[PDB]
Write a protein that binds this ligand. Structure first.
Ligand SMILES: Cc1cc2c(cc1C)N(S(=O)(=O)O)[C@@H]1C(=O)NC(=O)N=C1N2C[C@H](O)[C@H](O)[C@H](O)COP(=O)(O)OP(=O)(O)OC[C@H]1O[C@@H](n2cnc3c(N)ncnc32)[C@H](O)[C@@H]1O
Length: 498
């Protein structure tokens, strides 16, 4: 039936939009293809950890996988599983694999919690049509507050065994003349201190993050979505996937929506219509809906920029072998706390986080997630045969990202007399993982496929709210930018359109 506003998805763009719609008195239905994660599983916990993966770890896969970088230690805990509506989806394209969350809260369920504002000078470079003053003076602070961003206690950080891995990379980087920065987070650092003291159930300190955190992490279900539900004007239907979007004759929108069970069985297909339609299905999901609608003729006035301008936020993973006198520890918090900021807006830029590893014994490995400035972009192209948007990205398109990461870490190796690991990402000698993405950005770029507030070009009352708006790169972990941009956009849309 009819609802005034529909929001597709329940990640960052969706959650901001639904809160503000509800507060404005607009009855809003959110449609989420994954589960509401609130039922204890066979171990009494909602989520599996990285040492005990099961069907809850994976969106419709028949075997668990090791976290990237840890196959050598964690393949031993992999098991065959039933295909199930689990929390983490590795989406495989021809030469790129994109990780995304599936559930009420989207990627906030599975992410590292790192809550970082981009450098203003870079924001100005990537989005020159947007007023940076309101973003930095109003919308970024609003987002940080609503998200419950907090900061690690520096004395605790210095002293705790759980961050030895971070201190080791800080020392090594320092010998190359590179400093580090603390990374704010939505994981409660006070709670984390009490975990280490044995006072509360462990999560970050029990090898949990990418399949969810049973404690500590303030995912969107606790923050924006709880507040949205609190307005009395927002409902969320789960295991409901939107498949098609059309314009009705009077200028509203109608959706076909499949309801499934957790085994993936089709229970029903529903029609849902609305006056205002907000896409928050992610870089992958929003872009797929729109390229499908254009190229199957249901939204024929979508422009040629729909699908274009995708990038992986320059994501590259690499690792260094430490000297035997610099062990990283058997006990590593699953939430990063430190990064190396070598980002100057040039093509050599790197913002690297010092990533923990879950093995739980000493390996001497330092792991890094590098964020780089690589101008290469991919395009999502609709395949009518399989009814899927295919990403056309090739691995050689990540060569500039690898080059920038390698230049930075070569400096660190030279200053320390260390070498890379070459064996963490498969049997072939490979020091730089260059075909994964945690931070997909673009496909429906702000000001290209949409106006400067995410209004889809060619259509009225049709909006995109999420990572698909961002032009391929933000130079830092992206969710704070997605949240702040969504605050700006929905506020303007409500004022002028609703
Ligand atoms: C997978 C992953 C991601 C991250 C990280 C680790 C890992 C392991 N870590 S780090 O450590 O790597 O850095 C990050 C971190 O600490 N900090 C950060 O800023 N971002 C991190 N990301 C990235 C962010 O999580 C990401 O940028 C945001 O979540 C993107 O937000 P948004 O663009 O709003 O989308 P979403 O993916 O959260 O949510 C989309 C939702 O829509 C659902 N959905 C999709 N299509 C739908 C459809 N057709 N019908 C109905 N529902 C439909 C999805 O199921 C989902 O819930």
């Amino acid at each position: 039936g009819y609802v005034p506003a529909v929001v597709i998805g329940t990640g960052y763009g969706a959650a901001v939009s639904a809160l503000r719609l509800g507060e404005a008195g607009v009855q809003t239905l959110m449609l989420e293809m994954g589960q509401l994660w609130n039922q204890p599983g066979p171990d009494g916990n909602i989520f599996c950890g990285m040492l005990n993966p099961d069907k809850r770890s994976s969106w419709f896969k028949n075997r668990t996988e090791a976290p990237l970088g840890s196959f050598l230690w964690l393949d031993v805990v992999n098991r065959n599983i039933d295909p199930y509506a689990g929390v983490l989806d590795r989406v495989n394209y021809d030469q790129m694999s994109v990780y995304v969350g599936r559930g009420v809260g989207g990627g906030s369920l599975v992410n590292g919690g790192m809550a970082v504002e981009p450098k203003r000078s870079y924001f100005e470079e990537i989005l020159p049509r947007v007023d940076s003053s309101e973003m930095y003076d109003r919308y970024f602070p609003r987002a940080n507050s609503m998200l419950r961003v907090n900061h690690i206690d520096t004395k605790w950080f210095e002293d705790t065994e759980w961050y030895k891995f971070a201190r080791v990379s800080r020392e090594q980087a320092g010998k190359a003349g590179l400093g580090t920065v603390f990374v704010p987070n939505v994981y409660d650092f006070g709670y984390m201190q009490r975990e280490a003291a044995g006072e509360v159930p462990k999560s970050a300190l029990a090898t949990e993050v990418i399949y969810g955190n049973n404690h500590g992490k303030q995912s969107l279900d606790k923050t924006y979505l709880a507040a949205a539900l609190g307005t009395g004007k927002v409902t969320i239907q789960t295991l409901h996937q939107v498949k098609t979007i059309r314009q009705t004759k009077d200028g509203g929108y109608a959706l076909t929506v499949e309801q499934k069970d957790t085994d993936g069985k089709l229970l029903a297909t529903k029609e849902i219509s609305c006056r205002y339609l907000f896409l928050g299905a992610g870089s992958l999901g929003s872009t797929e809906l729109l390229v499908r609608a254009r190229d199957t003729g249901t939204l024929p006035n979508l422009n040629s920029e729909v699908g274009a301008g995708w990038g992986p936020n320059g994501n590259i993973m690499t690792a260094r072998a430490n000297h035997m006198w610099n062990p990283t520890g058997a006990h590593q918090s699953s939430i990063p706390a430190l990064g190396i900021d070598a980002w100057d807006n040039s093509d050599s830029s790197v913002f690297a986080e010092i990533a923990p590893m879950p093995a739980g014994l000493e390996t001497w490995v330092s792991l890094y997630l590098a964020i780089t400035k690589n101008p290469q972009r991919g395009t999502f192209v609709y395949d009518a045969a399989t009814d899927r948007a295919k990403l056309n990205w090739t691995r050689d398109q990540n060569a500039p990202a690898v080059n920038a990461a390698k230049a930075l870490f070569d400096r660190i190796n030279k200053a320390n007399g260390t070498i890379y690991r070459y064996d963490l990402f498969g049997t072939q000698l490979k020091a730089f993982a260059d075909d994964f993405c945690y931070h997909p950005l673009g496909g429906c770029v702000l000001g290209k496929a949409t106006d400067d507030y995410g209004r889809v070009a060619g259509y009225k009352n049709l909006y995109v709210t999420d990572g698909s708006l961002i032009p391929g790169s933000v130079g830092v972990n992206p969710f704070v930018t997605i949240t702040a941009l969504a605050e700006r956009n929905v506020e303007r849309i409500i004022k002028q359109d609703v």
